[PDB]
């Protein structure tokens, strides 16, 4: 019945920085709103509940407002801990207990284009009749990127997985390998193997290719 | 302080049946409503069942309802899931959790993770990323390939290499089966003189593997 929306889903906001996240319900739930954080690799905990109440031994940088559908979760100055997945909480007729989709607190950072490699299958998983080509795109933000394959010019769906790493501690990037598997029958009838890099850090995309055998 | 600890978690068939315990300390068990919670692999929380303070309220997510069965043990200082019938999409972290006035989650425990999946167990296969040797950076890794259950670790040089390392998350494969990569960037200046060691770990399976990764002929 109540629906609660966490839009933007990201916020890209830089350390000691306000922030301001936003929940809408779809309709009132007067006061009745939590906040939730999940730190790295952690629990969940409360916030914030009844819209703007601190939970005991929250920090003070913690502040929320809001009544109706309209709700804000403020943090005052961003510490390490804080880029972290906020969720918002509501609870309808008594026994239906809801959740926002959450909003990720990300570091911002000046655009940085990733470096790109493409690695053949080795000869040993060959033997097995599977061949996996990897592409790595390594230390870039924004997180936003895109891969696409191609064999032999042929572009390639659905046959590809792609991971993604957390910010770096350090620097504050993202990298990023997709998967390309084909079978060992088809990986052998093909020469060209290209992996297309488009980034807002690119001014144009960036191939990198091999032909198989060379 | 209050505390919430689960136990039971672990891999299951598909079909079968699990039960998770959290036990609650430094507060009145018996004084408030027991939840769980849970978060699927990469994905936001999803409330799954409520039980009120003595047990004679229960509730569920329409997608557990039926299949799972909340209860608690107020002389023990425990809340259970029973999780029946187990599907695919049942696997996640639950969490237990309490309340002190019944809207929202107060406290919470530090989850149990239940893996919903017909596989069997199997350490990975370890293929090398072999680098290019072609700002003269280059980047080689290993490919840990079809394991289960998770989690694999991988170190480089036995933890002598830490710096340009990225270890991606796992993928599932419609085989069932995990597959990571582990890659660092290095000079490639170094290519012909230092060695690369990859060290994977998968416990699950006892599997210890160590592959050098050189450039190929």
């Known amino acids: 019945e109540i629906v609660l929306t966490q839009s933007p889903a990201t916020l890209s906001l830089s350390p000691g920085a306000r922030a301001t996240l936003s929940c809408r319900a779809s309709?009132?739930?007067?006061?009745?709103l939590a906040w939730y954080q999940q730190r790295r690799g952690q629990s969940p905990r409360l916030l914030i509940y009844?819209?703007?109440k601190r939970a005991t031994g929250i920090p003070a940088r913690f502040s929320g407002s809001g009544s109706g559908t309209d709700f804000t979760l403020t943090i005052s100055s961003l510490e390490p801990e804080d880029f972290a997945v906020y969720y918002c909480?509501?609870?309808?007729?008594?026994?239906?207990?809801?959740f926002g989709q959450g909003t990720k607190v990300e570091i911002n950072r000046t655009v940085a284009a990733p470096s790109v490699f493409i690695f053949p299958p080795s000869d040993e998983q060959l033997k097995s009749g599977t061949a996996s080509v990897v592409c790595l795109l390594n230390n870039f933000y924004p997180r936003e990127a895109k891969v696409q394959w191609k064999v032999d010019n042929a572009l390639q769906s659905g046959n590809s997985q792609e991971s993604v790493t957390e910010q770096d501690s350090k620097d504050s990037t993202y990298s990023l390998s997709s998967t390309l598997t084909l079978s060992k029958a088809d990986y052998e009838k093909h020469k060209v193997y290209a992996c297309e890099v488009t980034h807002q850090g690119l001014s144009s995309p960036v191939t990198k290719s091999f032909n198989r055998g060379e | 302080q209050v505390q919430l600890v689960e136990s039971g978690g672990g891999v299951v068939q598909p079909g079968r049946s699990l039960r998770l315990s959290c036990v609650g300390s430094g507060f009145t068990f018996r004084r408030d409503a027991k939840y769980w919670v849970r978060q699927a692999p990469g994905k936001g929380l999803e409330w799954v069942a409520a039980i009120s303070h003595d047990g004679g309220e229960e509730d569920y997510a329409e997608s557990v309802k039926g299949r799972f069965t909340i209860s608690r043990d107020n002389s023990r200082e425990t809340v259970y899931l029973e999780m029946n019938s187990l599907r695919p999409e049942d696997t996640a972290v639950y969490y237990c959790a309490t309340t002190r006035s019944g809207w929202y989650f107060d406290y919470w425990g530090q989850g149990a993770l239940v893996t919903v999946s017909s596989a069997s167990t199997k350490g990975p296969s370890v293929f090398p990323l072999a680098p290019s040797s072609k700002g003269g950076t280059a980047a080689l890794g290993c490919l840990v390939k079809d394991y289960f259950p998770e989690p694999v670790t991988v170190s480089w040089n036995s933890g002598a290499l830490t710096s340009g390392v990225h270890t991606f998350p796992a993928v599932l494969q419609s085989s069932g089966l995990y597959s990571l990569s582990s890659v660092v960037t290095v000079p490639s200046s170094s290519l012909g003189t230092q060695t690369y060691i990859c060290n994977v770990n998968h416990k699950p399976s006892n599997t210890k593997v160590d592959k050098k990764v050189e450039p190929k002929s």
């Open positions: 309709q009132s739930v007067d006061t009745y």
């Open positions: 909480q509501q609870r309808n007729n008594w026994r239906t207990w809801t």
């Open positions: 009844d819209a703007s």
